[PDB]
Each structure stands twice: as structure tokens, then as C-alpha cells.
Amino acid sequence: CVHHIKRRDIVLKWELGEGAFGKVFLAECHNLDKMLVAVKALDFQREAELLTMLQHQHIVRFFGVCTEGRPLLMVFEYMRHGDLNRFLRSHGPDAKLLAGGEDVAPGPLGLGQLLAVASQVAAGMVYLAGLHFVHRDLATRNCLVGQGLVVKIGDFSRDIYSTDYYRVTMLPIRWMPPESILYRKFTTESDVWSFGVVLWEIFTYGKQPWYQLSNTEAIDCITQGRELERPRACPPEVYAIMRGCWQREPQQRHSIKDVHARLQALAQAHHHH
Ligand SMILES: c1cncc(CNc2ccc3ncnc(Nc4ccc(N5CCOCC5)cc4)c3n2)c1
Ligand SMILES: [Cl-]
């Protein structure tokens, strides 16, 4: 089902960044005549199958693979502003004094932009839950930002701090509910919990959840029922949505459809203000 692209049709331009299990290049792709794309260089067939199967406005567009020798390539649409975690951090309260001279309006993202970012990640999660698909690793580091604040889920691995994953098989324990940490029970309800944690990342401008703690201390705090504090930039109504995602019992957590509807209502009420 995965579309195969000829190596000759892929012209690598320059590296955009590099992660753990691969590199990311800006490239030009022919016969897709001349298109600007992002190429990830390294199961490969299973991850490619998933990206082929998924098709939504808030899931990164996938064009196919190149298995003509080595290295294995994955072709995606180019998302200009990169990963959402770095985007949040570089557009936070300390965006002006740290940004470059050419950078357009350096400063923190306003409430309207934070809600639009949150609403687009939720739209992608609504699509995944409708297909009974469990992501298992939802976090801003796995999201991408394109021109005009277009936000999409881009991956189904890399990290900002090495502490994002815990060796139990690497688990993103800071994003996980107690049933996932304790029994590896992954469901659309464990994904809604991770979405509540993504909301916390958005409203802290990309801070690591439980940053003050080591992964073993975070496991203890999470399983004991400790809740992440309300971020300074988070309105009380957004924190109430986070708490709805964080109900201890998986079946008591708000559905992603209701979370999305509430984020969309708040975003619409703030558009003209
Ligand atoms: C990340 C999240 N989700 C999916 C991925 C792979 N998939 C895709 C697809 C399309 C892409 N279009 C542009 N950029 C992409 N990724 C990219 C570019 C630069 C960085 N860095 C490295 C660290 O310092 C700052 C710059 C990071 C990631 C990208 N990744 C990657
Ligand atoms: Cl509340």
C-alpha cells in the first residue's frame, strides 16, 4: 500500500535537523514535477504503512518511501517552523531577547494562538480515536508546525531532554496515566490523558512535565495521583479541561471530541479579542 519513490527523484538540499534514529533533510522531489519536501533518513514498513493509512488535515502528509538501497528514506510534506516543542520554547516569554534580527514580531504567542495550537492537535486526536487508533506517544515533540500556525501530528522517535523517556523498551512516563505506567495499558483514554499533558506543555511554552523530578520520582508522583500545577499563562477554563483529561479512572476522562469542541468554543470566543 506504501507508495515507492525512485532515489533519482529525491535531491537532498540541506539538513533541517537530526534526531536519535535518523536525520531530516529539506529536499526537492520530482514526479510527485518539482516539490519541496522533508525526508527522514534511517519496523520501517509498519511505520510507513501507518502514515499511508492515516489521512487528515492535522496529520503530516506522507508521500512514500525509498527502499532503493541505503539509507531508508521517508518522504513527507515540509513543515517550515519545525517541531512544536521548539516552536513553543522559541516563541515564549523570552522570545524577543533571544530571537534573531530577521525574526518577524518576536515575543510570546498570545492566548488566541495557544488555543489554535491546542485545538489543531485535538482535531488530529479526534480523527485517530474515530479509527480506534491509539497513538501511545502524544507530546509536542511529536507534532510539527507549518507556515501560518498550521499544527499537525507528525510522528507515531526523538526527545528534547534525554529524560523524556524512561527505560523500563522506552516509555514517555511524564505523558502517561497510572494504568499505562503500571500495566502498559494503552487506549484512547491513555491518549486523552497525554493530550491533557500536551495542553500543559502548550500553556507553559514547552516546559517538560515534572521537570523538577527524575523519571522514578515522576512515576511515584503520577501513580500517587499528583497533578501538574496550573501554568501562569493558563486561563482557569483551560486548566479545567486538563483536569477533565486527568481523571484517575480511564472511563471517567472527557472524550477527545468534547475536549476539541470546548477548545474550539474558547478559541472562537477569543478571536475578536
Ligand atoms: C519531529 C516531529 N515529528 C516528526 C518528525 C519527522 N517528520 C517530519 C516531517 C516533516 C518535517 N518538516 C520539517 N521539519 C521536520 N522536522 C525537524 C526539523 C528540524 C528539527 N530541529 C532539530 C533540533 O533543533 C532544531 C531543529 C527537528 C525536526 C519534519 N519532520 C520530526
Ligand atoms: Cl476545575
GROMACS .gro file of C-alpha atoms and ligand atoms in nm:
model
  305
    1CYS     CA    1   0.000   0.000   0.000
    2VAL     CA    2   0.303   0.229   0.071
    3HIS     CA    3   0.397   0.441  -0.236
    4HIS     CA    4   0.759   0.385  -0.356
    5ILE     CA    5   0.968   0.680  -0.485
    6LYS     CA    6   1.282   0.643  -0.706
    7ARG     CA    7   1.609   0.768  -0.535
    8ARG     CA    8   1.695   0.973  -0.853
    9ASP     CA    9   1.370   1.174  -0.796
   10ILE     CA   10   1.494   1.277  -0.441
   11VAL     CA   11   1.753   1.564  -0.437
   12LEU     CA   12   1.870   1.641  -0.077
   13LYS     CA   13   1.920   2.016  -0.026
   14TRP     CA   14   2.034   2.059   0.337
   15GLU     CA   15   1.980   1.918   0.683
   16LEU     CA   16   1.687   2.079   0.880
   17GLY     CA   17   1.779   1.889   1.197
   18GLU     CA   18   1.887   1.548   1.334
   19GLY     CA   19   1.727   1.325   1.597
   20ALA     CA   20   1.805   0.987   1.757
   21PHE     CA   21   1.725   0.709   1.499
   22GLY     CA   22   1.756   0.935   1.188
   23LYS     CA   23   1.821   1.270   1.012
   24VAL     CA   24   1.577   1.521   0.849
   25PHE     CA   25   1.663   1.696   0.527
   26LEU     CA   26   1.492   1.964   0.321
   27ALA     CA   27   1.469   1.812  -0.027
   28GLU     CA   28   1.322   1.853  -0.370
   29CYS     CA   29   1.111   1.566  -0.504
   30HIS     CA   30   1.043   1.512  -0.876
   31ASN     CA   31   0.734   1.333  -1.026
   32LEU     CA   32   0.514   1.356  -0.711
   33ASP     CA   33   0.747   1.783  -1.125
   34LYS     CA   34   0.942   1.982  -0.857
   35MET     CA   35   0.820   1.982  -0.495
   36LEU     CA   36   0.971   2.099  -0.168
   37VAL     CA   37   0.961   1.801   0.080
   38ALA     CA   38   1.110   1.681   0.412
   39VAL     CA   39   1.297   1.349   0.404
   40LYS     CA   40   1.364   1.134   0.708
   41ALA     CA   41   1.674   0.908   0.665
   42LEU     CA   42   1.701   0.599   0.890
   43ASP     CA   43   1.000  -0.198   1.157
   44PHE     CA   44   1.019   0.063   0.880
   45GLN     CA   45   0.741  -0.096   0.666
   46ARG     CA   46   0.492  -0.085   0.961
   47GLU     CA   47   0.554   0.289   1.040
   48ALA     CA   48   0.528   0.369   0.665
   49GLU     CA   49   0.200   0.163   0.646
   50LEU     CA   50   0.054   0.370   0.936
   51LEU     CA   51   0.148   0.704   0.776
   52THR     CA   52  -0.001   0.585   0.442
   53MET     CA   53  -0.328   0.474   0.610
   54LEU     CA   54  -0.373   0.799   0.807
   55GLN     CA   55  -0.509   1.095   0.606
   56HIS     CA   56  -0.628   1.408   0.785
   57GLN     CA   57  -0.564   1.786   0.783
   58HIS     CA   58  -0.394   1.760   1.122
   59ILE     CA   59  -0.171   1.455   1.045
   60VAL     CA   60   0.154   1.529   0.846
   61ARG     CA   61   0.111   1.446   0.472
   62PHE     CA   62   0.315   1.137   0.380
   63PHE     CA   63   0.425   1.085   0.014
   64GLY     CA   64   0.604   0.748   0.045
   65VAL     CA   65   0.938   0.568   0.093
   66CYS     CA   66   1.265   0.492  -0.091
   67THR     CA   67   1.391   0.135  -0.032
   68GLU     CA   68   1.641   0.155  -0.327
   69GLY     CA   69   1.949   0.058  -0.121
   70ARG     CA   70   2.069   0.257   0.184
   71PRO     CA   71   1.974   0.468   0.380
   72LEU     CA   72   1.597   0.401   0.401
   73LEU     CA   73   1.406   0.725   0.328
   74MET     CA   74   1.063   0.855   0.434
   75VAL     CA   75   0.911   1.145   0.234
   76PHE     CA   76   0.675   1.400   0.399
   77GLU     CA   77   0.541   1.745   0.328
   78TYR     CA   78   0.781   2.014   0.457
   79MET     CA   79   0.665   2.182   0.787
   80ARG     CA   80   0.863   2.512   0.785
   81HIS     CA   81   0.851   2.600   1.158
   82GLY     CA   82   0.971   2.252   1.273
   83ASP     CA   83   0.875   2.057   1.590
   84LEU     CA   84   0.604   2.210   1.813
   85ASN     CA   85   0.811   2.184   2.136
   86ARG     CA   86   1.097   2.403   1.997
   87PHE     CA   87   0.837   2.630   1.835
   88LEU     CA   88   0.666   2.687   2.180
   89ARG     CA   89   1.001   2.748   2.363
   90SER     CA   90   1.134   2.992   2.099
   91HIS     CA   91   0.803   3.185   2.093
   92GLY     CA   92   0.765   3.210   2.475
   93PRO     CA   93   0.804   3.499   2.727
   94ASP     CA   94   1.182   3.513   2.641
   95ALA     CA   95   1.133   3.514   2.257
   96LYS     CA   96   1.242   3.879   2.192
   97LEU     CA   97   1.580   3.896   2.378
   98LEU     CA   98   1.679   3.556   2.228
   99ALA     CA   99   1.539   3.571   1.869
  100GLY     CA  100   1.732   3.675   1.558
  101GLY     CA  101   1.733   4.012   1.387
  102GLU     CA  102   1.523   3.893   1.087
  103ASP     CA  103   1.258   3.718   1.311
  104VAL     CA  104   0.906   3.857   1.248
  105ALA     CA  105   0.738   4.005   1.563
  106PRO     CA  106   0.946   3.825   1.835
  107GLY     CA  107   0.750   3.781   2.156
  108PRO     CA  108   0.526   3.527   2.330
  109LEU     CA  109   0.243   3.353   2.150
  110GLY     CA  110  -0.085   3.510   2.267
  111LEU     CA  111  -0.383   3.320   2.418
  112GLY     CA  112  -0.555   3.303   2.078
  113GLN     CA  113  -0.253   3.135   1.912
  114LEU     CA  114  -0.206   2.887   2.208
  115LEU     CA  115  -0.578   2.784   2.181
  116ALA     CA  116  -0.549   2.745   1.799
  117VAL     CA  117  -0.238   2.523   1.851
  118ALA     CA  118  -0.429   2.317   2.116
  119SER     CA  119  -0.741   2.287   1.902
  120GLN     CA  120  -0.546   2.156   1.596
  121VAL     CA  121  -0.363   1.880   1.797
  122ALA     CA  122  -0.709   1.782   1.947
  123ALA     CA  123  -0.859   1.771   1.589
  124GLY     CA  124  -0.586   1.522   1.491
  125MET     CA  125  -0.656   1.316   1.806
  126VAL     CA  126  -1.036   1.321   1.729
  127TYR     CA  127  -0.950   1.165   1.388
  128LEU     CA  128  -0.728   0.894   1.545
  129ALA     CA  129  -0.995   0.798   1.811
  130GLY     CA  130  -1.260   0.767   1.533
  131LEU     CA  131  -1.041   0.497   1.369
  132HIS     CA  132  -0.989   0.329   1.714
  133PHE     CA  133  -0.620   0.411   1.670
  134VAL     CA  134  -0.407   0.462   1.986
  135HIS     CA  135  -0.104   0.693   1.937
  136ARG     CA  136   0.082   0.596   2.267
  137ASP     CA  137   0.334   0.882   2.243
  138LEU     CA  138   0.145   1.209   2.208
  139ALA     CA  139   0.369   1.506   2.306
  140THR     CA  140   0.455   1.846   2.143
  141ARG     CA  141   0.800   1.697   2.038
  142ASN     CA  142   0.596   1.461   1.805
  143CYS     CA  143   0.398   1.748   1.646
  144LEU     CA  144   0.503   1.982   1.360
  145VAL     CA  145   0.431   2.349   1.281
  146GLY     CA  146   0.394   2.477   0.924
  147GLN     CA  147   0.360   2.835   0.792
  148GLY     CA  148   0.051   3.022   0.917
  149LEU     CA  149   0.042   2.836   1.255
  150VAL     CA  150  -0.071   2.506   1.090
  151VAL     CA  151  -0.018   2.229   1.351
  152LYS     CA  152  -0.010   1.856   1.274
  153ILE     CA  153   0.079   1.528   1.447
  154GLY     CA  154   0.390   1.418   1.263
  155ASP     CA  155   0.523   1.102   1.431
  156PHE     CA  156   0.387   0.764   1.560
  157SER     CA  157   1.140   0.863   1.791
  158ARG     CA  158   1.329   1.166   1.935
  159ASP     CA  159   1.342   1.386   2.253
  160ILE     CA  160   1.436   1.739   2.379
  161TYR     CA  161   1.590   1.627   2.710
  162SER     CA  162   1.707   1.265   2.739
  163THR     CA  163   1.477   1.244   3.049
  164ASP     CA  164   1.157   1.244   2.824
  165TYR     CA  165   1.185   0.865   2.810
  166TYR     CA  166   1.234   0.611   3.086
  167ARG     CA  167   1.397   0.267   3.034
  168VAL     CA  168   1.153   0.019   3.197
  169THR     CA  169   1.153  -0.050   2.576
  170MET     CA  170   1.145   0.332   2.637
  171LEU     CA  171   0.836   0.482   2.799
  172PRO     CA  172   0.730   0.854   2.791
  173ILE     CA  173   0.621   0.819   3.161
  174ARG     CA  174   0.568   1.204   3.213
  175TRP     CA  175   0.287   1.190   2.946
  176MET     CA  176   0.133   0.867   3.074
  177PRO     CA  177  -0.159   0.793   3.312
  178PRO     CA  178  -0.114   0.545   3.607
  179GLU     CA  179  -0.263   0.238   3.422
  180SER     CA  180  -0.008   0.282   3.131
  181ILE     CA  181   0.294   0.325   3.364
  182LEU     CA  182   0.191   0.033   3.585
  183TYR     CA  183   0.048  -0.222   3.336
  184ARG     CA  184   0.127  -0.086   2.984
  185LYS     CA  185  -0.246  -0.046   2.927
  186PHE     CA  186  -0.264   0.187   2.620
  187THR     CA  187  -0.605   0.303   2.498
  188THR     CA  188  -0.780   0.612   2.351
  189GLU     CA  189  -0.826   0.709   2.731
  190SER     CA  190  -0.449   0.697   2.796
  191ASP     CA  191  -0.414   0.922   2.479
  192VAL     CA  192  -0.669   1.174   2.619
  193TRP     CA  193  -0.455   1.188   2.939
  194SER     CA  194  -0.143   1.259   2.720
  195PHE     CA  195  -0.348   1.530   2.543
  196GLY     CA  196  -0.408   1.695   2.886
  197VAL     CA  197  -0.027   1.685   2.936
  198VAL     CA  198   0.020   1.839   2.578
  199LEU     CA  199  -0.216   2.125   2.687
  200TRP     CA  200   0.017   2.176   2.990
  201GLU     CA  201   0.320   2.182   2.751
  202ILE     CA  202   0.143   2.440   2.527
  203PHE     CA  203   0.047   2.673   2.814
  204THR     CA  204   0.399   2.654   2.982
  205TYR     CA  205   0.557   2.737   2.634
  206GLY     CA  206   0.706   2.388   2.603
  207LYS     CA  207   0.830   2.307   2.955
  208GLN     CA  208   0.892   1.941   3.034
  209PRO     CA  209   0.613   1.800   3.259
  210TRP     CA  210   0.752   1.729   3.612
  211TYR     CA  211   1.084   1.897   3.508
  212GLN     CA  212   1.183   1.928   3.880
  213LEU     CA  213   1.170   1.545   3.906
  214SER     CA  214   1.367   1.244   3.783
  215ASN     CA  215   1.165   0.978   3.596
  216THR     CA  216   1.146   0.746   3.907
  217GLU     CA  217   1.013   1.038   4.124
  218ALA     CA  218   0.766   1.128   3.839
  219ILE     CA  219   0.642   0.761   3.829
  220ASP     CA  220   0.580   0.783   4.210
  221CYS     CA  221   0.406   1.124   4.188
  222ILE     CA  222   0.185   1.018   3.890
  223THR     CA  223   0.077   0.677   4.037
  224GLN     CA  224   0.007   0.852   4.378
  225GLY     CA  225  -0.233   1.092   4.195
  226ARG     CA  226  -0.029   1.416   4.194
  227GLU     CA  227  -0.150   1.675   3.946
  228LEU     CA  228   0.065   1.914   3.736
  229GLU     CA  229   0.019   2.277   3.862
  230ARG     CA  230  -0.175   2.534   3.660
  231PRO     CA  231   0.066   2.721   3.428
  232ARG     CA  232   0.094   3.102   3.481
  233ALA     CA  233  -0.036   3.163   3.120
  234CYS     CA  234  -0.315   2.903   3.151
  235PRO     CA  235  -0.674   3.051   3.199
  236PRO     CA  236  -0.880   2.859   3.469
  237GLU     CA  237  -1.116   2.724   3.199
  238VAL     CA  238  -0.820   2.562   3.012
  239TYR     CA  239  -0.690   2.405   3.340
  240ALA     CA  240  -1.044   2.262   3.399
  241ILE     CA  241  -1.012   2.091   3.050
  242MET     CA  242  -0.669   1.949   3.161
  243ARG     CA  243  -0.830   1.813   3.485
  244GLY     CA  244  -1.106   1.654   3.272
  245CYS     CA  245  -0.833   1.460   3.076
  246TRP     CA  246  -0.667   1.361   3.407
  247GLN     CA  247  -0.950   1.173   3.584
  248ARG     CA  248  -0.794   0.871   3.763
  249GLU     CA  249  -1.038   0.617   3.611
  250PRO     CA  250  -0.991   0.591   3.229
  251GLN     CA  251  -1.374   0.571   3.167
  252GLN     CA  252  -1.430   0.900   3.369
  253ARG     CA  253  -1.194   1.105   3.144
  254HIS     CA  254  -1.357   1.351   2.895
  255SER     CA  255  -1.376   1.226   2.535
  256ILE     CA  256  -1.132   1.390   2.283
  257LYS     CA  257  -1.442   1.504   2.082
  258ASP     CA  258  -1.572   1.707   2.383
  259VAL     CA  259  -1.219   1.836   2.465
  260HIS     CA  260  -1.183   1.953   2.098
  261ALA     CA  261  -1.535   2.112   2.099
  262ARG     CA  262  -1.451   2.303   2.421
  263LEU     CA  263  -1.109   2.423   2.284
  264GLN     CA  264  -1.284   2.535   1.959
  265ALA     CA  265  -1.553   2.726   2.162
  266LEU     CA  266  -1.282   2.906   2.370
  267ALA     CA  267  -1.077   2.982   2.054
  268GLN     CA  268  -1.393   3.128   1.880
  269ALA     CA  269  -1.481   3.341   2.187
  270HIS     CA  270  -1.125   3.491   2.187
  271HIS     CA  271  -1.084   3.553   1.802
  272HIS     CA  272  -1.200   3.915   1.811
  273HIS     CA  273  -1.020   3.996   2.142
  274LIG     C1  274   0.981   1.583   1.452
  274LIG     C2  275   0.849   1.568   1.492
  274LIG     N1  276   0.760   1.493   1.426
  274LIG     C3  277   0.803   1.431   1.314
  274LIG     C4  278   0.932   1.440   1.265
  274LIG     C5  279   0.971   1.371   1.136
  274LIG     N2  280   0.891   1.409   1.021
  274LIG     C6  281   0.897   1.533   0.965
  274LIG     C7  282   0.814   1.567   0.855
  274LIG     C8  283   0.823   1.693   0.804
  274LIG     C9  284   0.915   1.785   0.859
  274LIG     N3  285   0.926   1.910   0.805
  274LIG    C10  286   1.016   1.989   0.865
  274LIG     N4  287   1.094   1.963   0.970
  274LIG    C11  288   1.083   1.841   1.025
  274LIG     N5  289   1.147   1.812   1.141
  274LIG    C12  290   1.250   1.873   1.214
  274LIG    C13  291   1.329   1.977   1.165
  274LIG    C14  292   1.423   2.038   1.247
  274LIG    C15  293   1.439   1.997   1.380
  274LIG     N6  294   1.539   2.052   1.460
  274LIG    C16  295   1.635   1.967   1.532
  274LIG    C17  296   1.657   2.024   1.670
  274LIG     O1  297   1.699   2.161   1.664
  274LIG    C18  298   1.601   2.242   1.598
  274LIG    C19  299   1.574   2.194   1.457
  274LIG    C20  300   1.356   1.896   1.429
  274LIG    C21  301   1.264   1.834   1.347
  274LIG    C22  302   0.993   1.744   0.969
  274LIG     N7  303   0.983   1.618   1.020
  274LIG    C23  304   1.022   1.518   1.336
  275CL      CL  305  -1.152   2.296   3.752
   0.00000   0.00000   0.00000
